[PDB]
């Protein structure tokens, strides 16, 4: 724990079972796991199983 950094929140990885997917909404212009540029508010879907 440093003085120049702050823990905004603890984020528990969301479990994605098979035949399920997560709807992710980007809060800012950015990239994603695969490498697709996501603009603010553009909801996309991730189908990777696991956590």
């Amino acid at each position: 724990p440093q003085k120049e950094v702050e823990v905004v929140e603890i984020i528990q990885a969301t479990v994605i079972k098979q035949n399920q997917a997560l709807r992710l909404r980007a809060r800012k212009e950015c990239f994603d796991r695969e490498g697709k540029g996501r603009v603010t508010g553009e909801e996309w879907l991730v189908r990777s199983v696991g956590a």
Binding site: R27, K28, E29, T40
Partner: protein
């Protein structure tokens, strides 16, 4: 020397927001091109203004 405005945190801007920076009095910026007495420009996204 009187403390006009007391101790305060800095002004940080969110990635998807901007600041309406309006010059109150005539002055020259660090790059030094020109500024009117009442020009308005937009401080951009993620960063921190002085």
């Amino acid at each position: 020397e009187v403390l006009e405005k007391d101790i305060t945190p800095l002004q940080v801007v969110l990635p998807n927001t901007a600041l309406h920076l309006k010059a109150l009095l005539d002055f020259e910026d660090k790059n030094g091109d020109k500024v009117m007495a009442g020009d308005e420009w937009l401080f951009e996204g993620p960063g921190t203004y002085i």
